[PDB]
């Protein structure tokens, strides 16, 4: 929704499913997955951020 | 009776497996059907 806002993940395949992550950047220039989110826990690959579509995030 | 095992055991343990393996080897690598 906005920079720095916490969002609950809804991507079923995501390692951070049902977890809270902070939005880093949002691309207003179209794009299918514009909302970059960062989570505290690192996934199995060691990364802690991913791009999601606004439909795949619960706002708060 | 008392003569058959001599006749059959060699056939079942040597001749039968030999021919069976020959035919299976032919068919596995036939390259057609």
């Amino acid at each position: 929704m906005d920079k720095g806002s916490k969002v609950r993940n809804l991507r079923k395949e995501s390692y951070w499913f049902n977890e809270i992550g902070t939005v880093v950047t949002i691309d207003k220039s179209g794009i299918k997955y514009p909302a970059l989110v960062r989570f505290t826990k690192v996934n199995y690959s060691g990364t802690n951020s991913t791009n999601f579509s606004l439909d795949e995030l619960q706002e708060v | 009776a008392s003569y058959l095992p001599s006749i059959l055991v060699p056939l079942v343990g040597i001749v039968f497996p030999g021919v069976a393996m020959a035919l299976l080897f032919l068919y596995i690598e036939k390259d057609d059907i």
Binding site: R8, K12, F17, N18, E19 | -
Partner: protein
């Protein structure tokens, strides 16, 4: 009584085992001069064996056909001494431990260096938490009825849930 077990107080096999242990220790000590350090050690072993067997006889344990004590663990109060009483102690101690641990996890977890505080323990805070475990059952029940014990369904899961 219980399952055809005769109390170890009147168990001939129990006394035979005691005699066998004592006599074998005596045979072992017969090859040392009286008063030698090995002789004193073996005599102390004999005394300890006698005390152990006497304590088992006086305790009220049930012997089998083999002469060894058997434990009744069906909840019988007369035999609680065998399993119920120690078990409670365990569930207390471990409980304490567990509770304390959980608290530490939930105390240092609200920091940026939460990971760094697990390899390196904050000994002052750690002891602060550890000293509070003697009331772990009450605190656990209070958290349970207060909803602060369990996390909501909104937590990590897998594709098929």
């Amino acid at each position: 009584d219980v399952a055809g077990l005769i109390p170890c107080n009147e168990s001939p096999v129990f006394t035979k085992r005691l005699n066998a242990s004592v006599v074998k220790l005596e045979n072992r000590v017969k090859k040392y001069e009286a008063g030698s350090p090995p002789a004193l050690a073996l005599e102390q072993q004999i005394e300890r064996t006698k005390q152990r067997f006497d304590r088992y006889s006086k305790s009220g344990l049930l012997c089998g056909k083999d002469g060894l004590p058997h434990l009744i663990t069906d909840g019988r109060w007369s035999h609680s001494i065998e399993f119920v009483i120690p078990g409670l102690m365990f569930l207390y101690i471990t409980g304490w431990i567990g509770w304390v641990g959980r608290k530490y996890i939930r105390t240092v977890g609200g920091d940026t260096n939460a990971t760094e505080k697990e390899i390196i323990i904050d000994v002052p805070l750690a002891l602060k938490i550890m000293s509070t475990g003697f009331i772990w059952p009450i605190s656990a029940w209070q958290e349970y009825i207060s909803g602060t014990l369990l996390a909501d369904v909104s937590e990590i899961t897998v594709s098929p849930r």
